[PDB]
Amino acid sequence: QELQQIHQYIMALREEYFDPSIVGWTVKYYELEEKIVSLIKNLLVALKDFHSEYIVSASNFTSQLSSQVEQFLHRNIQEYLSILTDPDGKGKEKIA
Known part of the structure; x- marks a missing residue:
């Protein structure tokens, strides 16, 4: 919009x-x-x-x-729970 004001000012001079x-x-x-x-x-x-x-595309890809x-x-939470859980058993099979 300001372009028309500038143009009118220039023309009037x-x-x-x-x-x-x-x-x-x-x-x-x-x-x-x-x-x-x-x-x-x-x-x-x-x-x-x-x-x-x-x-629009930027927002969509950001959200996705x-x-x-x-x-x-x-997945990290699953790993955290697994570590909180104590291991057992399977070592004997692997060593055999």
Whole structure:
């Protein structure tokens, strides 16, 4: 939005403090300025769609990948319980 304000400020100066030879020669310059401002504003608008597209995927992959840590933690909890449990028996078979 600020681009239009800047463009209007720039265009107004051409006449506020100056008296160009012919007014009709200024409007073509204004039209070219509007072309360029439209280009810049189009780029700015286009940024937002790409940003949303990236954000949705980033959040989805964050949630999906982050969930794997809990499964590994559960495996570690199983190992912790196993160590808390005392071993027995199977050593004799292995030594035989």
